[PDB]
């Protein structure tokens, strides 16, 4: 009867920035004890419902999204915050009410040589509306010259890698970010706590 949080929060692999695996979870009892205690949670900031009173209100339908972010720009994950991660590959709607979680992680997110498997979007024809997947590698064209479909003098591949290293610094190191979104009154509450 317990929610499959262990099936989302804890895992060995994750999408980089754009293949974020949106998992919808319902028909459960919501527990906000392990999350509330924070423990190793780097930043438990939540936009919308207060974090203290989460286990009181019965939500309708809840989604979990996960990805990895560079960290110096973790703040970009919030309503009405432009940038490069919040504007091209993961857009949060204005009326967002859920919570955002960030875990500091170097032990499991950086090989000795340096990870190159955390691609994130770099260019796009138009800004991305909230909550829209973007999984496609079609070469961009900065200039007027059409480069066809290989590359060009003003054409780039729209997926660059973070370039992680074990040392890096206090910033510029992988932060695993997971955001929970709640629907307001779609139907009678389906998940609630004790």
């Amino acid at each position: 009867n317990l929610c499959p949080f262990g099936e989302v929060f804890n895992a060995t692999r994750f999408a980089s920035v754009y293949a974020w695996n949106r998992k919808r979870i319902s028909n459960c009892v919501a527990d906000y004890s392990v999350l509330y205690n924070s423990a190793s949670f780097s930043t438990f900031k939540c936009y919308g419902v207060s974090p203290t009173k989460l286990n009181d209100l019965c939500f309708t339908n809840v989604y979990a999204d996960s990805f990895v972010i560079r960290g110096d720009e973790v703040r970009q994950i919030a309503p009405g915050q432009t940038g490069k991660i919040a504007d091209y590959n993961y857009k949060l709607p204005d009326d967002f009410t859920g919570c955002v979680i960030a875990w500091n992680s170097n032990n499991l997110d950086s090989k000795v040589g340096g990870n190159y498997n955390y691609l994130y979007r770099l260019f796009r024809k138009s800004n991305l509306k909230p909550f829209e997947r973007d999984i496609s590698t079609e070469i961009y064209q900065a200039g007027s010259t059409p480069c066809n479909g290989v590359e060009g003098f003003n054409c780039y591949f729209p997926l660059q890698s973070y370039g992680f290293q074990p040392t890096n610094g206090v910033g510029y190191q992988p932060y695993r970010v997971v955001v929970l979104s709640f629907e307001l009154l779609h139907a009678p509450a389906t998940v609630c706590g004790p």
């Epitope: 770099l122 479909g149 003098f153 780039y156 997926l159």
Partner: antibody
Framework: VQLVESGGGVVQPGRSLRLSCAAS????????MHWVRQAPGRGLEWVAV????????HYVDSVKGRFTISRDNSKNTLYLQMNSLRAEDTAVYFC?????????????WGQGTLVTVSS | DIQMTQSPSSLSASVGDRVTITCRAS??????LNWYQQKPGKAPNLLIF???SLQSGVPSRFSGSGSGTEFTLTISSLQPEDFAAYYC?????????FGQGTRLEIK
């Protein structure tokens, strides 16, 4: 993460030869792919490139028409068909992916495939 | 369409920290380049990323600057395990013609 190639040999001047390039590890359906030629005891030249969807086929202005290249994402392979070959084609072919301005696409090459058409 | 030339094409490098390779293009390339290495009978691997950027997996000795129409790779040591090809490659247009090649001696 690796990639290998097969289909080489020695044949008469002028015939249909199909060679395959199979790559595992890095996802194959996201990046273009290039074929590069190296003649023995000389530099190396470029022949052709294929995009991710296999809709565009750019070639060098030396084997235009003779060569053809396609991809099979489900099989996760690159197929190069060369026909009406001539003597100078004798060389070693490499199946590669080449970076242009960003560190996104990897740069693995395999080993190569020798093909001489003296017969 | 685009044709390249690297002047030396052959050099002798005894004990010394000053070995350089010059690469030149017919048309203004800006800062689009690649410099690759090829050991005798081995698959070539990267040596320089683009114009003046390195690629993780090689020491910091290798260097290269200059954009537009002239390019110069330079090294600052010997480490007698890098005597191999120093090929030059373009990333400007679809022709993408390579260079000629180079060889390193032992004196």
């Amino acid at each position: 993460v690796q990639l290998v190639e097969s289909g080489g040999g020695v044949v008469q001047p002028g015939r249909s030869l199909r060679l395959s390039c199979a790559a595992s590890g890095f996802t194959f359906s996201h990046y273009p792919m290039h074929w590069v030629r190296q003649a023995p005891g000389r530099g190396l030249e470029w022949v052709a490139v294929i995009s991710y969807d296999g809709s565009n086929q750019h070639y060098v202005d030396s084997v235009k028409g003779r060569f053809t290249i396609s991809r099979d994402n489900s099989k996760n392979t690159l197929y190069l068909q060369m026909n009406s070959l001539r003597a100078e084609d004798t060389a070693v072919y490499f199946c590669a992916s080449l970076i242009t301005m960003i560190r996104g696409v990897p740069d693995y090459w395999g080993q190569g495939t020798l093909v001489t058409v003296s017969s | 369409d685009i044709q390249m030339t690297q002047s030396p094409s052959s050099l002798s490098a005894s004990v010394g920290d000053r070995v350089t390779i010059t690469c030149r293009a017919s048309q203004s390339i800006s800062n689009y380049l690649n410099w690759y290495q090829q050991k005798p009978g081995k698959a070539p691997n990267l040596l320089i990323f683009a114009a003046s950027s390195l690629q993780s997996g090689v020491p910091s000795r290798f260097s290269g600057s200059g954009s537009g129409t002239e390019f110069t790779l330079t090294i600052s040591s010997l480490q007698p395990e890098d005597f191999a090809a120093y090929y030059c490659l373009q990333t400007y247009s679809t022709p993408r013609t390579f260079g000629q090649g180079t060889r390193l001696e032992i004196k």
